[PDB]
Enzyme design. Structure first.
Site, PDB file in Angstrom:
ATOM      1  N   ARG A  29      17.090  68.167  80.301  1.00 18.57           N
ATOM      2  CA  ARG A  29      18.664  68.520  79.759  1.00 18.57           C
ATOM      3  C   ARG A  29      19.181  69.410  79.036  1.00 18.57           C
ATOM      4  O   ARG A  29      18.123  70.120  78.369  1.00 18.57           O
ATOM      5  CB  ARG A  29      18.737  67.360  78.959  1.00 18.57           C
ATOM      6  N   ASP A  34      27.022  71.555  77.072  1.00 17.01           N
ATOM      7  CA  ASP A  34      27.851  69.664  78.155  1.00 17.01           C
ATOM      8  C   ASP A  34      28.783  70.956  79.444  1.00 17.01           C
ATOM      9  O   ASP A  34      29.652  71.586  79.288  1.00 17.01           O
ATOM     10  CB  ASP A  34      28.790  69.069  76.478  1.00 17.01           C
ATOM     11  N   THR A  35      27.906  70.371  80.580  1.00 18.17           N
ATOM     12  CA  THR A  35      28.922  70.123  81.479  1.00 18.17           C
ATOM     13  C   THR A  35      29.412  69.087  82.011  1.00 18.17           C
ATOM     14  O   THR A  35      29.697  67.847  80.805  1.00 18.17           O
ATOM     15  CB  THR A  35      28.203  70.514  83.122  1.00 18.17           C
ATOM     16  N   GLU A  37      30.858  65.854  84.025  1.00 20.34           N
ATOM     17  CA  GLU A  37      30.111  64.655  84.854  1.00 20.34           C
ATOM     18  C   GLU A  37      30.913  65.122  86.597  1.00 20.34           C
ATOM     19  O   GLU A  37      31.921  65.740  85.951  1.00 20.34           O
ATOM     20  CB  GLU A  37      30.540  63.232  84.608  1.00 20.34           C
ATOM     21  N   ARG A  75      14.187  62.507  78.164  1.00 14.72           N
ATOM     22  CA  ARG A  75      14.631  63.515  79.156  1.00 14.72           C
ATOM     23  C   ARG A  75      14.329  64.946  78.481  1.00 14.72           C
ATOM     24  O   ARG A  75      14.722  64.801  77.000  1.00 14.72           O
ATOM     25  CB  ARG A  75      16.421  64.002  79.476  1.00 14.72           C
TER      26      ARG A  75
HETATM   27  C1  LIG Z   1      21.891  68.188  75.006  1.00 10.68           C
HETATM   28  C2  LIG Z   1      21.390  66.762  74.126  1.00 10.68           C
HETATM   29  C3  LIG Z   1      21.822  65.464  74.212  1.00 10.68           C
HETATM   30  N1  LIG Z   1      21.513  65.083  73.296  1.00 10.68           N
HETATM   31  C4  LIG Z   1      22.028  63.514  74.193  1.00 10.68           C
HETATM   32  C5  LIG Z   1      23.095  62.766  73.069  1.00 10.68           C
HETATM   33  C6  LIG Z   1      23.732  61.848  73.948  1.00 10.68           C
HETATM   34  O1  LIG Z   1      23.363  60.674  73.124  1.00 10.68           O
HETATM   35  P1  LIG Z   1      24.771  59.354  73.774  1.00 10.68           P
HETATM   36  O2  LIG Z   1      23.900  59.324  75.136  1.00 10.68           O
HETATM   37  O3  LIG Z   1      24.418  58.237  73.228  1.00 10.68           O
HETATM   38  O4  LIG Z   1      26.046  59.946  74.096  1.00 10.68           O
HETATM   39  C7  LIG Z   1      24.003  62.565  74.868  1.00 10.68           C
HETATM   40  C8  LIG Z   1      24.718  63.282  75.820  1.00 10.68           C
HETATM   41  O5  LIG Z   1      23.896  64.010  76.782  1.00 10.68           O
HETATM   42  P2  LIG Z   1      24.541  63.861  78.443  1.00 10.68           P
HETATM   43  O6  LIG Z   1      26.102  64.932  78.651  1.00 10.68           O
HETATM   44  O7  LIG Z   1      23.643  64.442  79.482  1.00 10.68           O
HETATM   45  O8  LIG Z   1      25.364  62.537  78.570  1.00 10.68           O
HETATM   46  O9  LIG Z   1      22.097  62.784  75.379  1.00 10.68           O
HETATM   47  C9  LIG Z   1      20.710  64.665  72.685  1.00 10.68           C
HETATM   48  O10 LIG Z   1      20.209  63.719  72.091  1.00 10.68           O
HETATM   49  N2  LIG Z   1      19.272  66.005  72.308  1.00 10.68           N
HETATM   50  C10 LIG Z   1      20.744  66.580  72.921  1.00 10.68           C
HETATM   51  O11 LIG Z   1      19.859  67.469  72.396  1.00 10.68           O
HETATM   52 CA   LIG Z   2      27.714  66.587  80.822  1.00 11.87          CA
END
Ligand SMILES: Cc1cn([C@H]2C[C@H](OP(=O)(O)O)[C@@H](COP(=O)(O)O)O2)c(=O)[nH]c1=O
Ligand SMILES: [Ca+2]
Length: 129
Positions: A29, A34-35, A37, A75
């Site tokens: 990731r 944030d892109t 969905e 991830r």
């Molecule tokens: C980019 C990033 C996302 N995340 C977690 C936060 C969000 O948790 P929640 O799923 O509980 O919302 C989720 C968002 O990722 P996505 O945008 O891929 O869904 O990923 C991290 O923990 N650390 C990071 O650096």
């Molecule tokens: Ca996303």
């Protein structure tokens, strides 16, 4: 920070890519972005942008930051480079991702990315349109 080798396994969507890293598959990731969905406005365009960028590269690299290297979903959290160009930055510069998820101590490239976001916004590109 330093770049390490990886090889693309599969583009996934605008801000996730499956790479092989130290010989093991893992889903990365992208830090600090944030892109949308795939189901959302610009989501397909983000996915297509990241896919072409990683599939076309001769060389993929990963760069972890100073803090967490995996998130709660297992991830990898990294800056990803395609022939030396940072995918995270490119997506923001094109208005296909917002700067987002800026957590303390994994935020080395925050100001670079924010600078890119400001210029995307000025250009009213994509998300900013
Ligand atoms: C980019 C990033 C996302 N995340 C977690 C936060 C969000 O948790 P929640 O799923 O509980 O919302 C989720 C968002 O990722 P996505 O945008 O891929 O869904 O990923 C991290 O923990 N650390 C990071 O650096
Ligand atoms: Ca996303």
């Amino acid at each position: 920070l330093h770049k390490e080798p990886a090889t693309l396994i599969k583009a996934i969507d605008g801000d996730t890519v499956k790479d092989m890293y130290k010989g093991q598959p893992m889903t990365f990731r992208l830090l600090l972005v944030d892109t949308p969905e795939f189901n959302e406005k610009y989501g397909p365009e983000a996915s297509a942008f990241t896919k072409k960028m990683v599939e076309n590269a001769k060389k993929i690299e990963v760069e972890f930051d100073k803090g967490q290297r995996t998130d709660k979903y297992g991830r990898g959290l990294a800056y990803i480079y395609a022939d030396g160009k940072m995918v995270n930055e490119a997506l923001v510069r094109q208005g296909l991702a917002k700067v987002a998820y800026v957590y303390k101590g994994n935020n080395t490239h925050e100001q670079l990315l924010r600078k890119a976001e400001a210029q995307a916004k000025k250009e009213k590109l994509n998300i900013w349109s």
